[PDB]
Design a binder for this molecule. Structure first.
Ligand SMILES: Cc1cc2nc3c(=O)[nH]c(=O)nc-3n(C[C@H](O)[C@H](O)[C@H](O)COP(=O)(O)OP(=O)(O)OC[C@H]3O[C@@H](n4cnc5c(N)ncnc54)[C@H](O)[C@@H]3O)c2cc1C
Ligand SMILES: Cc1cc2nc3c(=O)[nH]c(=O)nc-3n(C[C@H](O)[C@H](O)[C@H](O)COP(=O)(O)OP(=O)(O)OC[C@H]3O[C@@H](n4cnc5c(N)ncnc54)[C@H](O)[C@@H]3O)c2cc1C
Ligand code: SF4
Ligand code: SF4
Ligand code: SF4
Ligand code: SF4
Ligand code: SF4
Ligand code: SF4
Ligand code: SF4
Ligand code: SF4
Ligand code: SF4
Ligand code: SF4
Ligand code: SF4
Ligand code: SF4
Ligand SMILES: [Fe+3]
Lengths: 652, 652
């Protein structure tokens, strides 16, 4: 049968129509071979727009549909479901991107944008003619979830999925769950003890009947697709018998190697054999082989003889249906902003280091003290937006929680020592959520915390006393201030965690300009990724506070529970297949596939290649490399792409 | 059985110990009758502290445990689980608050604070002796959910629950779903049309096999408890047969009565027979009997003969297990800030009215025009924080979205008319989330939008031209500005919706100081309420944007899916019960219960009262009002409270 194409040009209100002359593109589409219906509408994805396509498919007997509008990455599934409801196979639908790829980037070149939209429509129509009906492949869903990261976001996802009755696996990189929330003393805007409220959730997730906790473990490999993921978890060796470990801590006293305690942000010193924090879950000790000298002094003191250097990491193979990435964030390193002197001046600290100094279980015993002489500071300055809203460090985003934690920690210091003078150097006070503006009012009115509108130019240390001078313009007075302080606290921003690169490659997910993980859509899908079966939750998706991370943890559980609850999902049949009559078994395709899908086999007395359909992810590398043309990727066949290329210059 | 009490005095590091002499309180606890074990520890909620109680329950055969520490509102579940793990019934545990109620508020009166701690311990020990072992009530869960409000948040909850396989009911007050998002033209920070994200979701929810949509309907009654709610939905009469209606709108072109369109904020004119907006769902019409003259002109053009003036509202009785409140918000009415002249000056508009003016399907055809002469403004001023961060109007909170929508609408006006001059009068620019700070940078750098740091004192109209003058101090220059504008846009804040009072009474939920709905906990249960089985999602819980409302919608689906998935939930046994041997059926208790749990019945030939256990919420009002003493609330019995009162002055 000959193609009967329906072309739809969206205006997207004025997003497309305001730059591209949609009525003119619609008239041009009609001049193309096989195009029998062409219409322009304000919103093609809206009810009237979708009903218009369906009605035309039936009335004009269309076997191809072209929608010139937004990106397929946003509404391709939406229009595929729309055409399928009218009886048209979803793979006979073609998208032409004239918004993100045209109207939004050629706003001052309307005529050339209109001509580009015509060519993009002709290219879409050209490929559409040779598109073929493909059967959406129905695949089963393994009734099991995987959560990567055991912070407040990850713990919430696992608890929600576990409570729903779904088997869940929670992998935590460090020896304990809890994340950065465990490092905080209190939490704004209620000033609740962070661990005193998080600990119950850590306890709950550790003994949940539907949650398998793998602490001090890392996901080293993920293979497959939605509902059929095959994951490899490396249970790292603590070199201490897990079951015989009491958690008393007497073998550390003899260890001669001092390692900076990561949990205390480098202020504290721990041994090669240790426990992250006193309320850690699971409560067990670990040996760090990156700094261990293997002298065996700890083993002599240890009664249980739990210490075993011959311990080997275990690779656990698990099958899951959905994966939730909740690996969190890291604090920005302010060494780069040299004018502030971090790493040079002893009394210049970050806010996360202050959290630890303020924390009762911290290295200073909950006492805020100068690192140069151990004395309590009488005057403190907070410097906002350090590593945020700054093009010089490549971080042009708002870290979201720094205004609030600076005001919170200032209240905690005033509670401990009311005589302390505290000044906050800011640009904008961002107290945007429930009880936040009130917290800001309270900080000034009740605690006497002072606010200076002006981003400091530099910090100068007095080498004789260790005191610091903050140079900044009080923009509200139009005068330069040069106030002296005993301690300067840099309100550092949030950056993706160090392991984010490793996790990105394993899950096959993208990043946003801020370097955090990319959600499928900022409003249509805040916790989904463009990779089916992979979701996000917490700070790893972008800078945010606890309730936002907790809500995202719950949102991810719901979204990841949909495929599990359904028990069946549909996958794109854009896979490679070999034409046995043309393949002479050259073997070029075999090594090109990273999944090992194409394999040489015997057929009709001779050798030929054959693709294991289930192992093909549909990249199109082996068909591109096939020298005989026997290998072809459905939906991206060479002939289809060839006509698309012709479509840019002429009607084919 | 004789009470064997274990008393534990927490130091909370120095939070309690630094004011209260804990060792002295422990010595005093030992002098009380039945106290077998008394110990003081740094952190009672920590692993060593919890294990110390468990070990003592076993080794000293305790049948009562008293913990003198912080608030039960913080660690009551924690210590309940701790004692239950040692075999002790959780209702034989008593909490004494010596931190929030003593050490933290009597810091300068240590001696009196220690004597207060001793009395609080004696009061706890006194009640503890008469505490009894109790068991939780297990109840079934109806496999069905109810969502109130069909905005982006409510639609997301219903779609997620439906996709999970749970039957869901979505009740929408107005004739169409979509909410305030439907009124917006574009949406920050992507500047997508609001329709781009919302319409497909509206279409999906309207034809979902697991979602029953009741548009133009309201919940009039809710009875029961978690997993056993009995709801009454009033399907308001549209006076049109929905199944016969096509939604063509031939009727609207004939109707002679003009009613102000509520959807366009009074700026638009609709007919008696109307459709809220062109992309409305369901695509059906509605007759407003408040303004219909019943001429029957619309019925003559209606082909399928759907119009029926004899339509009566239907009361639908439905049984649900969980309820999600997503009723949204209303825009603040700026008439009260009289210095700005809203409702007095024709060219002073709200931001929500501007959304309708800018919208292509709006009353002005997407043209921003002055309401005094219909001309397009060349100079526009945006006034931030109108009805927010203001004690004079009783709204001391940040409305969260006004900074971003002002910058977004300014970008949109610049796109339609680049010659337009736009100034934004602000205090703090709150662009706190992903891509928000970048959107703010873009507004100034790309669109040339100007920012004036200064909250305007007043707006003065020129009665002769209709132009407005904005009086404000440019705080960054220390000079007073008196710039003239063609249009002044008030960036109005968010307030709870008008129906919020009705919904609050029906669901039995609380409100936070901002008047929005109260979540169970700000940090860990952001979408739950203290009322089991009732959840929140969207702007009705607090001012927030679409990404946050969508994530909350998904978070609520997950949380509301837990009881449904479990199929069984537990209810607290701290309920009222009647002692049949003492009750002579006086009937005083019956009308005191707002849930109607206590009921009169015939037993052994005589009248006696009986409480329906599942219906009791545990307030203790009817036992307090019982004149015979037959009615008692377990855990708060009169004898228990009597001993507690004695405990303040003496032992026992
Ligand atoms: C100084 C400061 C003060 C703050 N104060 C407050 C406050 O008062 N109130 C508030 O609400 N918020 C505050 N915040 C924000 C708060 O820290 C975050 O909201 C919160 O930690 C988010 O939790 P998360 O689970 O998403 O990530 P995280 O807390 O960082 O946890 C991530 C977890 O994943 C693990 N992980 C990382 N990589 C891997 C991997 N490859 N495999 C397995 N596991 C991995 C980590 O070890 C960690 O346990 C503050 C932030 C800072 C920096
Ligand atoms: C001028 C303006 C511009 C904005 N611009 C943006 C933007 O660009 N980007 C962005 O992200 N956010 C923006 N916002 C915020 C955005 O409007 C909200 O985030 C969003 O509408 C919240 O969705 P919701 O469902 O929670 O509330 P709503 O949109 O208000 O939905 C509530 C729904 O419940 C229904 N309802 C009410 N009462 C009852 C009842 N008793 N029974 C049944 N149903 C009921 C209502 O009719 C309504 O349909 C803007 C807000 C304003 C005022
Ligand atoms: S390794 Fe031995 S000494 Fe160290 S905590 Fe474990 S049991 Fe105690
Ligand atoms: S063997 Fe390793 S952990 Fe043990 S004492 Fe020596 S360096 Fe420390
Ligand atoms: S939240 Fe406050 S301190 Fe943090 S980057 Fe944004 S404006 Fe700066
Ligand atoms: S590359 Fe082409 S010809 Fe060679 S073995 Fe593979 S399918 Fe056959
Ligand atoms: S197209 Fe070829 S190389 Fe790519 S995943 Fe499929 S079989 Fe492997
Ligand atoms: S039990 Fe309460 S008072 Fe004692 S350490 Fe814990 S939080 Fe602080
Ligand atoms: S989202 Fe796509 S189809 Fe919908 S109105 Fe915007 S451009 Fe058109
Ligand atoms: S009531 Fe009749 S005329 Fe009006 S839209 Fe419905 S079908 Fe058309
Ligand atoms: S009968 Fe009512 S709805 Fe119909 S045209 Fe007359 S006023 Fe309008
Ligand atoms: S978001 Fe902006 S305009 Fe709105 S109340 Fe907060 S600071 Fe004021
Ligand atoms: S008030 Fe007391 S005595 Fe009277 S009916 Fe109720 S339980 Fe019986
Ligand atoms: S104690 Fe309160 S809720 Fe319970 S039966 Fe009596 S009045 Fe009703
Ligand atoms: Fe505690």
């Amino acid at each position: 049968e000959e193609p009967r194409i329906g072309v739809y040009v969206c205006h997207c209100g004025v997003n497309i129509g305001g730059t591209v002359d949609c009525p003119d593109v619609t008239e041009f589409a009609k001049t193309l071979k096989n195009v029998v219906v062409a219409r322009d509408y304000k919103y093609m994805c809206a009810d009237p727009g979708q009903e218009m396509i369906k009605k035309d498919i039936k009335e004009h007997n269309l076997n191809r549909v072209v929608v010139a509008a937004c990106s397929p990455r946003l509404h391709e599934p939406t229009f595929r479901r729309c055409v399928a409801e009218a009886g048209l196979n979803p793979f006979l639908f073609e998208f032409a991107n004239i918004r993100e790829h045209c109207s939004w980037v050629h706003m001052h070149e309307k005529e050339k944008a209109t001509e580009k939209a015509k060519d993009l429509v002709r290219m879409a129509v050209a490929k559409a003619r040779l598109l073929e009906p493909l059967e959406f492949i129905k695949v089963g869903v393994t009734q099991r979830a995987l959560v990567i990261g055991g912070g407040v976001a990850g713990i919430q996802t696992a608890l929600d999925l576990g409570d729903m009755g779904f088997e869940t696996i929670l992998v935590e990189k460090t020896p304990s769950v809890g994340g950065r929330m465990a490092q905080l003393d209190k939490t704004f805007p209620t000033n609740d003890c962070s661990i005193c409220i998080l600990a119950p959730k850590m306890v709950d997730v550790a003994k949940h009947p539907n949650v398998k906790l793998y602490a001090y473990s890392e996901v080293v490999d993920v293979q497959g697709y939605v509902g059929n993921f095959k994951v490899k978890i490396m249970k790292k060796a603590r070199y201490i018998d897990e079951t015989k470990c009491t958690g008393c801590g007497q073998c550390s006293e003899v260890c001669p190697i001092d390692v900076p305690n990561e949990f205390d942000m480098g202020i504290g010193m721990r041994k090669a054999i240790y426990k992250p924090f006193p309320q850690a879950v699971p409560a067990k000790y670990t040996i760090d082989k990156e700094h261990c000298i293997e002298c065996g002094l700890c083993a002599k003191v240890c009664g249980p003889n739990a210490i075993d250097f011959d311990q080997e990491p275990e690779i656990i193979e698990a099958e899951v249906g959905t994966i939730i990435c909740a690996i969190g964030y890291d604090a920005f390193d302010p060494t780069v902003r040299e004018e502030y002197g971090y790493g040079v001046y002893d009394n210049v600290v970050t806010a996360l280091e202050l959290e630890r100094m303020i924390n009762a279980s911290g290295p200073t015993g909950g006492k805020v003290i100068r690192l140069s002489d151990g004395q309590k500071p009488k005057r403190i300055a907070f410097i906002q937006c350090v590593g945020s809203r700054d093009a010089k460090v490549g971080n042009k985003y708002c870290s979201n929680v720094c205004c609030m934690y600076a005001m919170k920690n200032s209240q905690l210091i005033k509670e401990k020592s009311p005589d302390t003078e505290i000044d906050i150097y800011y640009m904008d006070i961002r107290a945007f959520s429930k009880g936040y503006e009130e917290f800001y009012e309270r900080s000034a009115k009740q605690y006497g915390i002072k606010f200076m509108r002006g981003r400091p130019s530099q910090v100068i240390e007095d080498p004789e006393t260790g005191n610091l001078v903050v140079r900044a313009e009080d923009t509200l007075l139009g005068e330069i201030l040069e106030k002296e302080y005993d301690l300067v606290v840099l309100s550092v921003g949030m950056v993706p965690t160090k392991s984010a690169d490793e996790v990105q490659k394993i899950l096959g997910i993208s990043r946003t300009p801020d370097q955090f993980f990319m959600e499928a859509h900022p409003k249509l899908r805040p916790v989904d990724t463009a990779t089916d079966g992979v979701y996000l939750a917490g700070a790893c998706q972008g800078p945010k506070d606890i309730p936002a991370s907790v809500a995202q943890g719950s949102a991810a559980a719901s979204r990841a529970a949909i495929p599990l609850a359904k028990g069946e999902v549909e996958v794109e049949p854009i896979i490679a297949s070999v034409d046995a009559e043309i393949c002479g078994g050259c073997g070029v395709c075999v090594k090109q596939c990273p999944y090992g899908a194409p394999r040489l086999v015997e057929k009709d007395g001779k050798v030929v290649a054959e693709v294991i359909s289930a192992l093909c992810k549909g990249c199109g590398t082996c068909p591109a490399g096939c020298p005989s043309g026997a290998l072809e990727q459905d939906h991206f066949k060479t002939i289809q792409l060839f006509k698309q290329i012709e479509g840019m210059f002429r009607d084919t």
